[PDB]
Each structure stands twice: as structure tokens, then as C-alpha cells.
Design a protein around this ligand. Structure first.
Ligand SMILES: [Cl-]
Ligand SMILES: [Cl-]
Ligand SMILES: [Cl-]
Length: 163
């Protein structure tokens, strides 16, 4: 585990992370996809061998010795707010299980269901709070990756508010 487990936020491409493993914001079919998923496909294409997994689950595939945790959040275009919220919570609980199983001291993680799976809503707070519910009992250093300058400020403020 980390000596003093922390949360941090960085505004940059998660394919350039400095952590011991990465969480892909995957689609259920293990396809290259777009956004974070396409960046992850270009950087770790070997990790997409048999990476298909259902909504609300995470499936780890090794690229060399580097673990890629494919986490499948719900597309809020298709799910009801209620069922989508349950699947989004579940995906992050499965990430925490994988991070623990792998024995890593650090993980790079995007905000699941905040981009093309957001159904056109701002889900920063919803997605981040489910990330914290899952990851608070883990001892890995967590580094959250985002692309927007206003999102960076809001995530940083949310981390600092817990102290
Ligand atoms: Cl970048
Ligand atoms: Cl998304
Ligand atoms: Cl963002």
C-alpha cells in the first residue's frame, strides 16, 4: 500500500499517467471506442484481448506487466437515472476490488460516465462521490485524470474539502 494514501487530480491525458496501473473508461464490447478509451487503445492495445465485460463490472488485462482495468460505466442515454446510478456505483466497487487484488500502490482513474455516456448531463459530483465511496477503503494513491480546466478546480476543491 501507499505510505500515506492520498487523492490527487491532474488535467492531462491518462495515457501519460505516472501510476502503477490505469482504469479505462471502457465500452462493454472491448472496442477501441473514443475519448479516454481510444487513448488507452493507442497506448496499451494488447490490453484489449478479451476485455469485453458487462455494464457495472471491471475486467483487468495485462499489457506486459502493466495492468489495464477496463471499467464499464452505464450510458445514461439508455439507463434510467435510478438504474444508471446503481450501475455507476457498482463499476467503481469492482475497480476497488481489482486495485486491491493487484497489490498496486497507485492507480490512475478517469470519472466514469461523465463524457459521451453522461446523457448530456453534468455528472462530476455524482461520479466523483461514487469513486470516493469505492476507493476510500483502499490504500492505493489515487490520481484522478480530467481534461477540462473548470472540472480540475471542482475535483481539487472536493478532495481538499474532506481535508
Ligand atoms: Cl496531455
Ligand atoms: Cl463516458
Ligand atoms: Cl473533464
Amino acid at each position: 500500500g501507499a505510505m500515506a494514501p492520498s487523492y490527487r487530480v491532474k488535467r492531462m491525458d491518462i495515457a501519460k499517467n505516472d501510476e502503477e496501473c490505469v482504469v479505462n473508461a471502457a465500452n462493454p464490447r472491448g472496442l477501441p471506442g473514443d475519448g479516454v478509451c481510444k487513448a488507452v487503445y493507442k497506448k496499451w492495445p494488447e490490453s484489449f484481448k478479451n476485455s469485453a465485460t458487462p455494464v457495472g463490472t471491471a475486467k483487468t488485462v495485462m499489457c506486459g506487466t502493466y495492468p489495464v482495468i477496463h471499467a464499464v460505466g452505464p450510458n445514461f442515454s439508455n439507463y434510467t437515472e435510478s438504474e444508471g446510478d446503481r450501475e455507476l456505483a457498482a463499476a467503481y466497487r469492482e475497480v476497488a476490488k481489482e486495485v486491491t487484488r493487484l497489490g498496486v500502490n497507485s492507480v490512475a482513474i478517469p470519472l466514469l460516465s461523465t463524457g459521451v455516456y453522461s446523457g448530456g448531463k453534468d455528472r462530476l459530483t455524482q461520479s466523483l462521490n461514487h469513486l470516493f465511496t469505492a476507493m476510500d477503503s483502499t490504500d492505493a494513491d489515487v490520481v484522478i485524470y480530467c481534461r477540462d480546466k473548470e472540472w480540475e478546480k471542482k475535483i481539487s476543491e472536493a478532495i481538499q474539502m474532506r481535508t
